[PDB]
């Protein structure tokens, strides 16, 4: 519940105001550069469907994962920063990211 980036951003973005979400990834890239991944390398999603795409380059990402001691209302996260390729599932028109499948 106290001031590291993940506790702060999970609350501000309305992920932990009414529950503790176990994991979430934030991508520190411009929205249009993340939207550009939907026309990059097509791959299978973890679920086997094929509307997933992997970024050609690594992107700056922060992984937020609940500690073993986190309990609503006191959600607590471990913050891990990394540069990884992201895999997103895309839908619609415009064909835009709707789910974050993984980082690699």
């Amino acid at each position: 519940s106290s001031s590291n980036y993940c506790n702060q951003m999970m609350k501000s973005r309305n992920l932990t105001k009414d529950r503790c979400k176990p994991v979430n990834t934030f991508v520190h890239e411009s929205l249009a550069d993340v939207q550009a991944v939907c026309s990059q390398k097509n791959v299978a999603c973890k679920n086997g469907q094929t509307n997933c795409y992997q970024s050609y380059s690594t992107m700056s990402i922060t992984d937020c994962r609940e500690t073993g001691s986190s309990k609503y209302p006191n959600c607590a996260y471990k913050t891990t920063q990394a540069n990884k390729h992201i895999i997103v599932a895309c839908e619609g028109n415009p064909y835009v990211p709707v789910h974050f499948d993984a980082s690699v």
């Binding site: 951003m9 973005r13 309305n14 992920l15 979430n24 990834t25 934030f26 991508v27 520190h28 890239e29 411009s30 929205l31 993340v34 922060t62 997103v88 839908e91 619609g92 835009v96 990211p97 709707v98 789910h99 974050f100």
Partner: peptide
């Protein structure tokens, strides 16, 4: 209310 694309942005983009 929020589309799936809007929800992705709110939950995962921090430009």
């Amino acid at each position: 209310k929020e589309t799936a694309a809007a929800k992705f942005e709110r939950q995962h983009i921090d430009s």
